[PDB]
Design a binder for these strands. Structure first.
Ligand SMILES: Nc1ncnc2c1ncn2CCN[C@H](CP(=O)(O)O)C(=O)O
Ligand SMILES: [Mn+2]
Lengths: 411, 555
DNA sequence: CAGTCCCTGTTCGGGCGCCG
DNA sequence: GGTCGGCGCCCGAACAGGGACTG
């Protein structure tokens, strides 16, 4: 008996038309059950082929969670309704969330099923369940309530959410609460013990209004990976050559980098393994450039209007470096992930884990999700990526193939 | 007109476009008889209705012969209606395959008569389905009808039928959960593990549940005895195989007969193993006409004779046993060709196939082997919903060395080594640190964008040198040519330093084949070597011998 | 500097097969 | 004959985006 918030597509845009990709057996059975249940609870209803819109669907298991979780790839729909959840009913981003000692994530997607959706907008929420070996044609449905994974869901529910959080935000005014998609980010500087207590205080505070999860973060313990130069005592011609190429590639970021004196050490057509002594002027050009790499870049600052972009470099031996930027050579954050899941046995699982860890930091620090430049073939990624996804959101990406230049990020 | 027992599907035209108003084709007198014979009969059953001048629309119509029957099929040329009809989302996500079927105690197959003519069309749409039937006289005004059901030839008819069919089968599938009903258009594979007595009971139960909605299951099309004929296969209680495949034997081959041949060769590759269409598809490249006669090449006539001998012997597939694991094994047939077989018990093939796509100019067997596994993995999940275990002709250490060093992300599912030559291996390895006691070559290339001329050479630490004039070249061709020279005039261990990013990248991807001849020559010299080390330096920065050679090949 | 072109990878349009 | 839809393959032509060099 709740009134529907009317929504419209962005002007001059048709709904998403994305084909459903093949799914494994355990996922199709997990969807048939959840869709049979959600159809019985009036959350969804079957449709027909008169609907020209469609959206992929698949299921996941969150970290250390046995229950299957339905997930919809609403990326093409969120790109076509972007004017609604940024202009009319936007959510502010707390700048202090990234500074908290501990932040916890909660799957609050269950509450969105309590609010009905606009009737004229149910045409664009259509998805299709495939069958093994195409036993039956596509079993189609559409959403009758607020869908999990949409961008307009936390915007429509924002008014009801604030009134649920006020009895808790008043009792705890020093605690930061942020709502991004189907996740609720709660940050506090309390000790790790009483922090988990206030979580269960909110889990029961939300159950009495009609709603469970738990994933711990520590944003204060997030470090950056600076550009480091090797500290050797004996240098060869090849060492200095690799050093210059690395220092020249960095000179695009830090304009105060010079290689004049070092290039003078490479005057003769010398053998690579030949040891070259470091001149007096060169040993200082090496020390000064080490300090500039300690300094932060001049003129770098986040822009809310610009899109976030992130690149990932595979460094071997379970090492992965990443950078987040909006303009070229103006990096907002660098870093390095190590010994993730699938280390030394699966690259795709590591790359999937890295995209999740990076996207999580993007939500905490800026409230946006970056578009990814992924070091993997398009066909290699679109085959295995769903098998290791453990999040309720999905970022946008693209596929690159840049051979190694000169190691700029890892030693 | 009475009301159909099946729910109708609302259809609209695309906003801002009116129904079709196009002139009718002239029809042969043998087809006009076959049309009016079907036009007047469907009018009696309530499937088409006459219209007056209040219907300003018109669309063509014709008829073709039905396969193995004296009856004709009626079709409509809705090429102008379909353009202005709304877009539909199809539900048939793929074709079922017999390899995904599970052994069922009892099997039954039946095909309903006139499938599209048993499902109604939306009411508000039938006005745009106007057409004229030209009489035997060019002066007779003709009888203008309009459709009442799904017109064979409309772009929405198959999508509407498959959805309406599933909605009628749901009350039967909900009451009969253990009855596996493969639903493809109008054909229904019905299997069950019930005793053969209770089987025919559920058969008539469905044959009466389908009749309640206007779906007739003719005893002419009823099939209770194996072998069943399903989706162009033969289904026996233990084995299955494709229905016989007929290839043309033309003496003078045209381009169309190759496509008719190549197409049937790909259809046979699902159970008949070892089919190759590399040289036969090499006839279709750059060809201008469809009916142009093409003489068969010597390598093409051999490939055709081999595939004919493979089709001679009988082959058969098996069914999917969910208790035992799935296995897939690949072989390197030819340069750019691969074939694979999926099975559960040895030599008992579930299905076979081939992968031969050439991606990019520069590739290696390990790159192609990965591309083939992904093509198989997607194919398997479509049919069985799982990833098969792989037996690959690549050493475990060979794959380990590749993916650990490769800068791209790459991975292969649970697999095991099989010693079946030719074994996929990396033909050369670039060293990671410079080689002591090896001559060091500083190479660079340069060319003029207008003259298409350039130089390419090197300087060494032992005083060696060379520069070569080049014609009809680019800046990139020179930079590779500068490396090809350094590899020619060096010993068995060589250090090479270039300032070309384009060259370093292609080589580090350890390619063993390429479309460019210069790359194939560079690959060849690399395999002869024992140790090779590459490095990159920024040009025009006064580096070692890189500047000296940037000024030697400057012109 | 913006303007190229050299090279490489992708996307789509168009034939046949197969099924109904 | 020259209808629709699905899926598959192979080809060329069109599209596109990055890297070196140039007014
Ligand atoms: N070449 C074709 N063009 C259009 N539609 C076709 C077709 N082949 C089969 N269908 C649908 C099923 N048709 C039969 C009866 P018919 O073959 O007389 O149409 C049925 O409805 O069961
Ligand atoms: Mn039929």
């Amino acid at each position: 008996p709740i009134e529907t918030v009317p929504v419209k597509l962005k002007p001059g845009m048709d709904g998403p038309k994305v084909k459903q990709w093949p799914l494994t057996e355990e996922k199709i059975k997990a969807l048939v059950e959840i869709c049979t249940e959600m159809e019985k609870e009036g959350k969804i209803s079957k449709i027909g082929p008169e609907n020209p819109y469609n959206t992929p669907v698949f299921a996941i298991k969150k970290k250390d969670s046995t229950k299957w979780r339905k997930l919809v790839d609403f990326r093409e729909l969120n790109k076509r309704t972007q004017d609604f959840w940024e202009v009319q009913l936007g959510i502010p981003h707390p700048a202090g969330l990234k500074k908290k000692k501990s932040v916890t994530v909660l799957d609050v997607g269950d509450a969105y099923f309590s609010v009905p959706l606009d009737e004229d907008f149910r045409k664009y929420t259509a998805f299709t369940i495939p069958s093994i070996n195409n036993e039956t044609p596509g079993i189609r449905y559409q959403y009758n309530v607020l869908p999990q994974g949409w961008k307009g869901s936390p915007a429509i529910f924002q008014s009801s959410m604030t009134k649920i959080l006020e009895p808790f935000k008043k009792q705890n005014p020093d605690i930061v609460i942020y709502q991004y998609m189907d996740d609720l980010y709660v940050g506090s500087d309390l000790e790790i013990g009483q922090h988990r207590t206030k979580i269960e205080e909110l889990r029961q505070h939300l159950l009495r209004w009609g709603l469970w999860m738990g994933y711990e973060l520590h944003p204060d313990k997030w470090t950056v990976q600076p550009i480091v130069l090797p500290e050797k005592d004996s240098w060869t011609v090849n060492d200095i050559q690799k050093l210059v190429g690395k220092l020249n590639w960095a000179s695009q970021i830090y304009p105060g980098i010079k290689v004049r004196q070092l290039s003078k050490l490479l005057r003769g057509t010398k053998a690579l393994t030949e040891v070259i002594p470091l001149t007096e002027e060169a040993e200082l050009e090496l020390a000064e450039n080490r300090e500039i790499l300690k300094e932060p870049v001049h003129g770098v600052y986040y822009d809310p209007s610009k899109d976030l972009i992130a690149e990932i470099q595979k460094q071997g031996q379970g090492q992965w470096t990443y950078q987040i930027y909006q303009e070229p050579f103006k990096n907002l954050k660098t870093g390095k992930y190590a010994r993730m899941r699938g280390a030394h046995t699966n690259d795709v699982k590591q790359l999937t884990e890295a995209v999740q860890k990076i996207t999580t930091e993007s939500i905490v620090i800026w409230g946006k999700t970056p578009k990814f430049k992924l070091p993997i073939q398009k066909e290699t990624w679109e085959t295995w990526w769903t098998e290791y996804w453990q999040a309720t959101w999905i970022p946008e990406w693209e596929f690159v193939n840049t051979p190694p230049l000169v190691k700029l990020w890892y030693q | 007109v009475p009301i159909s027992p099946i729910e109708t599907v609302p259809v609209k035209l695309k906003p801002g476009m009116d129904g079709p108003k196009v002139k009718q084709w002239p029809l042969t007198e043998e087809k006009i008889k076959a049309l009016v014979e079907i036009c007047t009969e469907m009018e009696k059953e309530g499937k088409i209705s006459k219209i007056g001048p209040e219907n300003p629309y018109n669309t063509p119509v014709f008829a073709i012969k039905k396969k193995d029957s004296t009856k004709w099929r009626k079709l409509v040329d809705f090429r102008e209606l379909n353009k202005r009809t709304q877009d539909f989302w199809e539900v048939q996500l793929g074709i079922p395959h017999p390899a995904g079927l599970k052994k069922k105690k009892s099997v039954t197959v039946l095909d309903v008569g006139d499938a599209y003519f048993s499902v109604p069309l939306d009411e508000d749409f039938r006005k745009y389905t106007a057409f004229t039937i030209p009489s035997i006289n060019n002066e007779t005004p003709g009888i203008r009808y309009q459709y009442n059901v799904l017109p064979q030839g409309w772009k929405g008819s198959p999508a509407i039928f498959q959805s309406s069919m599933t909605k009628i089968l749901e009350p039967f599938k909900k009451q009969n959960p253990d009855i596996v009903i493969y639903q493809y258009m109008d054909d229904l594979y019905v299997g069950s593990d019930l005793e053969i007595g209770q089987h025919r009971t559920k058969i008539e139960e469905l044959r009466q549940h389908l009749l309640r909605w206007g779906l007739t299951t003719p005893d002419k099309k009823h099939q209770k005895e194996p072998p069943f004929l399903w989706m162009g296969y033969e289904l026996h209680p233990d084995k299955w195989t494709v229905q016989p495949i007929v290839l043309p034997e033309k003496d003078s081959w045209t381009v169309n007969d190759i496509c008719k041949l190549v197409g049937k060769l790909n259809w046979a590759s699902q159970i008949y193993p070892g089919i190759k269409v590399r040289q036969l598809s090499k006839l279709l490249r750059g060809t201008k006409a469809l009916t142009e006669v093409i003489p068969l090449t010597e390598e093409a006539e051999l490939e055709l004779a081999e595939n004919r001998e493979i089709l001679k012997e009988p082959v058969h597939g098996v069914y999917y046993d969910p208790s035992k694991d799935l296995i897939a094994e690949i072989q390197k047939q030819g340069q750019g060709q691969w074939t694979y077989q999926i099975y559960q018990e040895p030599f008992k093939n579930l299905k076979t196939g081939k992968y031969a796509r050439m991606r990019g100019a520069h590739t290696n067997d390990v790159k192609q082997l990965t591309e083939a596994v992904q093509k198989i993995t997607t194919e398997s999940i479509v049919i069985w919903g799982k990833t098969p275990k792989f037996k690959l002709p690549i050493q475990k250490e060979t794959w380990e060395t590749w993916w650990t060093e490769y800068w791209q992300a790459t991975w292969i599912p649970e697999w095991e080594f099989v010693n079946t030559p030719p074994l996929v291996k990396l033909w050369y390895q670039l060293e990671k640190e410079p080689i002591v006691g090896a001559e060091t070559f500083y190479v660079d290339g340069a060319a003029n964008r207008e003259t298409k001329l350039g130089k390419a050479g090197y300087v060494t630490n032992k005083g060696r040198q060379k520069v070569v004039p080049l014609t009809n070249t680019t800046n990139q061709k020179t930079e590779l040519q500068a490396i090809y020279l350094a590899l020619q005039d060096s010993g068995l261990e060589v250090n090479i330093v270039t300032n070309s990013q384009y060259a370093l990248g292609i080589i580090q991807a350890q390619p063993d084949k390429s479309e460019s001849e210069l790359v194939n020559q560079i690959i060849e010299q690399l395999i002869k070597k024992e140790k090779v080390y590459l490095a990159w330096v920024p040009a025009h920065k006064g580096i070692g011998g890189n500047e000296q050679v940037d000024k030697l090949v400057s012109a």
